[PDB]
Structures are given as C-alpha cells and as structure tokens.
Design a protein around this ligand. Structure first.
Ligand code: N4L
Ligand code: N4L
Lengths: 304, 304
C-alpha cells in the first residue's frame, strides 16, 4: 500500500544522454543508435533567439562544429540535419547502451517521466503529465534543454518529449522526437499564449480509485450522477468533459473496487462543490490529476 | 524554474538489483562487489513470521538454498551470514555494474530516493523522507522487500535504506545496510507502535524558500518572530522545534532570497495559524516537508 508520484527507472535513458555544444551553447542530446537528437536552438546565440532564421543559422554550421561528448568520450559527427525543431547528428559509433526504443507522440492528459540533465549528465527524475494545453509543469533550469520525457513498457523506452524552453509564465514547452512542438509553441524568445488549461478528469477519478484501494475512503458518499449532470459540474470547475471512452478506460478500476464510475463521479462532484473541508486524500489537499488509470493499476499491481 | 518531488537518477542502483529466493519466498537483493544484501525474512514461511527464530531458521539453510539471479544469470553463493536483520550472501562474481558506493545511516527528516523493485526488476523511483518517527510513507506491494533507498553525490551512491515491511497502519519500515532497523521496529508480523510523528520544520521552511525562488510569494508577510515564539507555534501544530543548527542550515537559502530565517518563520507561523485560505504553494495545498534545504539548493542550482 501507499501511493506516490512514481517515475520510471531512468537507467535506460541515462545511458543515452550526451552533451552537445555548438559555438558557445551547450545542451543535452539523446544518443540512440548512430544518431544524436537535440533541440535545434543549440545553433543560436542570444541575439538570434528573438526570431532565429534556423535554416540560415544551420547553413553556417558544419559537422565539426557540433561537439558531442558521451560522458568523457568524444563522438565523431558525420552528418547533420534539421527535422522540424530537432537536429539529428549522425555519429560514426552506434550507442552501445541504446535500449529497445520507440518515438511516440503522447496525447494531452497522458503522463511520462522526465530525466532532467545538465551538460549531458542526469541530475534527477520526476513524473509529470502533458497538460490539456500541451505545456508541462516541469522543473528545469538553464542547460536543461534536450532533457527527455519517456515511458517504459518492460524493456522498451517510448520517448515522447524533448525539452526546448520555458515560457515567460514558468511552464515548459517542447517537442516529440521528430521535433514537432506539443501545442502552438515556437522555438523563439517571444510571449506565447498557452491555451486555457483544464483539470484531467479521467486522472482525478483514477486517483480517487487509487485512494479507495489504499484506504482513504472518507469522500465516498451515498450519491450517484449521470455523465450529463457530472459534465455540467466539470464545465463549472474547468475539468475536461468525461466521455464514455474515459468511463471505459476506468472499467478495470471500477471492477477492482466495485465502485461504479458514475458513483465515483458523484463523489468527485461533491468534492468539487464542497472542497476537502481541511482533509487530505493520499497525502494531498487538492484533487490530483497527474495519475492516469494505467498508472494507478501499474502502481497498485507492481508491473516491472 | 518549477519545483518537483525529484528523485535521483536510478541507473546506478538498477544495475545492483537481483532476485533472491529461499524456499518459496522471493524478494530483492542488492549486489555490490561480491556480496548480495537482502532482508533476513527471505528465510521465513508464513507460519514463521509471527515470531521467527531467525538463528534457527538460518541454520537449516545452506549456500545452495539461496537462489540469486541477476536478470537472467544465476549467481553462485559461496557464503552466507546474518548481520542484524540483513543476510549477506557472498557470491563468486563481483558485480561488474557496482557503482562507487557507501552505506550510511540517515537521520530522521533527511530525504532519499527509493527504487521500488519486484522479482529483482526495477518498477519505479520516488523521493521520500525518513519521518521523524523513523517510518517512511512509501509505495510498496508484496515482493517489494529488499528495495533500497539511496542518495547520489556525483558518482557515489550512499545506500541508506532497505525495505523490510509494511506496518498494519500502511506505513513502511526498514533497516540501514548493516540491517539495523530505523525506529523501534522488529521483523515480526505483530502490531508495532510507530512513535508520535511530527512535521519536519526545517524542510517546510526550505520549501517556502523554494516557493519564493520560483515566484510563489503570496505567503510573505510584514512580520517577524523569535526562535522561542516560533517554537511555541511549532509545539501547538506538532512541528519539530527549530534550533540554531536548523537556522544555520537555512543560511544559504536565506542569503539567496534575502529573507531572514526568522522572517520566513513568521510566514510559516501565519500559515499554521490561518491555513492556506484555499490557495496553493508550488502546486500544493498543504505545507510540504519532504524537501531538505540541500534538496532545494540542488534542484534550484542543477547539480548533476
Ligand atoms: C526564452 O528561451 C527560449 C525560447 C525559445 C527557445 C529556446 C529558449 O531558451 C533556450 C535555453 N533555455 C534554457 O536552457 C532554460 C530552460 C528551462 O526550462 N528553464 C530555464 C530557466 C532559467 C534559464 C534558462 C535559460 C532556462
Ligand atoms: C507483516 O509483514 C511482515 C512483517 C515483518 C517482516 C516481514 C513482513 O512481510 C514481508 C513481506 N512483505 C511484503 O512483501 C510487503 C511489503 C510492503 O511494503 N507492502 C506489502 C503490501 C501487501 C502485501 C505485502 C506482503 C507487502
């Protein structure tokens, strides 16, 4: 028992982190097979970043200008290319530590672990959610660019995120591993509107199920509701509308606890309307939305 | 910017996890050099656990009865010994993945990362604190015994905890790597009183400094207090008394923010007496005590 914001073991990803330097800019790269992936803004200078002409900046760069160092060893760069907002540096040596991997574009509301790195060295690992507005509320300082987000299914790492920047609001933005930004963001130092965010309803319900499994049951009530009635409350409280696909994803947790999804919706409805009254659920005094139904089952079943 | 419950990168510890089987019990072992460390209760059966005679149970066991498997390879056990509540299985092969390491006994209020494992396979990593009453509020299921707690200083892993059991209250208990339990706990299936717990005051103050650094400043007020006045409030709210050693440890954060420790104590005093009034600090609606002053500086400075 117990419920924690658990990250995947980061070992397989640690073995892929390298340092990429171009001119005076240093950031992190991901070395998979004979390719190092990194944010394309590694080729910029402070003057460039207000509106960089990436095509022109990259034309002035040659293979030998990209300094890639894996720990203490230097990699020889034999090709370079820009794909969307990422640079792909072909190296002459395949990473011997390359795990089985996939590149995936995650959906908003899904979760992943971030391995925060500086100068190609891992510093920490944390679990987070891709917000409905495509930002991530991460923890990143100068030099963290190129740190990646991932999920691990047994021996396969699915890389879903590469960190590109911090918005003026203090939230984070990045791309999939093909360099396509999540959200409307652009790799420029400009004011960028992140859309209206909402709370991930399916995750809050999944986390209420995790609470019941772990013994925190005070919020269970004698009520039920309908998808329509629940969605009127979710609208008022800036929660994502609950669909039958979400109810279906919550099926296993509903079966495990014997609490019908709409009955859990009625508990959530009461917590939204009345608050927690100074009480806590799984050590939290707010409604947590960073655990998916899959995460709750995985944590509550011990998948390795 | 941003502040997360960040765990150390678990790679160096993942390479040390093995599966230990004795009879029908399987749990996790830590393979460092030519020794595998595991909880001594691996030699018990369900009937034994109410009050096991460990010396007698171990006498019936021979080297060949301890099945140690590192991934898919089997280790040959050439010696066994019990030290306090741990078993030390001498194997004929030194772990090639043994990082530079130390065994340390952490103090209550200090933090560490746990690499939760099942059948010798890592499943997840999370950050937690050793509670003032020597329990840990972890997330562990059946088979998690032998999972370890650690801290990493550059290339050196300081192992501080090995998981032994879940108390009937749902909190966790374990030992240092010499097998000495933290707290009054014994490795028996019995009702065991965990002492009165308190909130880690120095950590809550460190986390308020992390909040100021990251932009959450609403709780700062026009007041100050004394160590004596603050300690009367800390007594009433079951917080650890603040000492000058704690103020001294908070020196660097006080210098970074320019907010005197006693002025931050006055903000904490007001939050204890008035609550958060439906507001949040670093995404939390309660006062967080699982970040030490060292953790706050490390996260806010990017140590790798
Ligand atoms: C405005 O910056 C960019 C905009 C578009 C593209 C790239 C931009 O920056 C690239 C460098 N950024 C970081 O390394 C950075 C990332 C982060 O998440 N937090 C920070 C906290 C303090 C200081 C810094 C520099 C960071
Ligand atoms: C009463 O148990 C012991 C007492 C003293 C000594 C050893 C004891 O158990 C050894 C086995 N324990 C676990 O593997 C276990 C650990 C844990 O943290 N959570 C669980 C959640 C559900 C089920 C189980 C079995 C666990």
């Amino acid at each position: 028992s117990g419920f924690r914001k658990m990250a995947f073991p980061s070992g397989k990803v640690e073995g892929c982190m390298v340092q990429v330097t171009c001119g005076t800019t240093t950031l992190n790269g991901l070395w998979l097979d004979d390719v190092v992936y990194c944010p394309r803004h590694v080729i910029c200078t402070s003057e460039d970043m207000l509106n960089p002409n990436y095509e022109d900046l990259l034309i002035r760069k040659s293979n030998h200008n990209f300094l890639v160092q894996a720990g203490n060893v230097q990699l020889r760069v034999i090709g370079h290319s820009m794909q969307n907002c990422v640079l792909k540096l072909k190296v002459d040596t395949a990473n011997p530590k390359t795990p089985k991997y996939k590149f995936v574009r995650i959906q908003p509301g899904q979760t992943f672990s971030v391995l925060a790195c500086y100068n190609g060295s891992p510093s920490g690992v944390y679990q987070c959610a891709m917000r409905p507005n495509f930002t991530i509320k991460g923890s990143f300082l100068n030099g963290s660019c190129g740190s990646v987000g991932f999920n691990i299914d047994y021996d396969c790492v699915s890389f879903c995120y590469m960190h590109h920047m911090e918005l003026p609001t203090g939230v984070h933005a990045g791309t999939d591993l093909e360099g396509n930004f999540y959200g409307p963001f652009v790799d420029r130092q400009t004011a960028q509107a992140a859309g209206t965010d909402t709370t991930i309803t399916v995750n809050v319900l999944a986390w209420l199920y995790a609470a019941v499994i772990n013994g925190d049951r005070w919020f269970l009530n004698r009520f039920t509701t309908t998808l329509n009635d629940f969605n009127l409350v979710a609208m008022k409280y800036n929660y994502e509308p609950l669909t039958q696909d979400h109810v279906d994803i919550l099926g296993p947790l509903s079966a495990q606890t014997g609490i019908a999804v709409l009955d859990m919706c009625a508990s959530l409805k009461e917590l939204l309307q009345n608050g927690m009254n100074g009480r806590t659920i799984l050590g939290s005094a707010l409604l947590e939305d960073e655990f998916t139904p899959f995460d709750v089952v995985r944590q509550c079943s011990g998948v390795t």
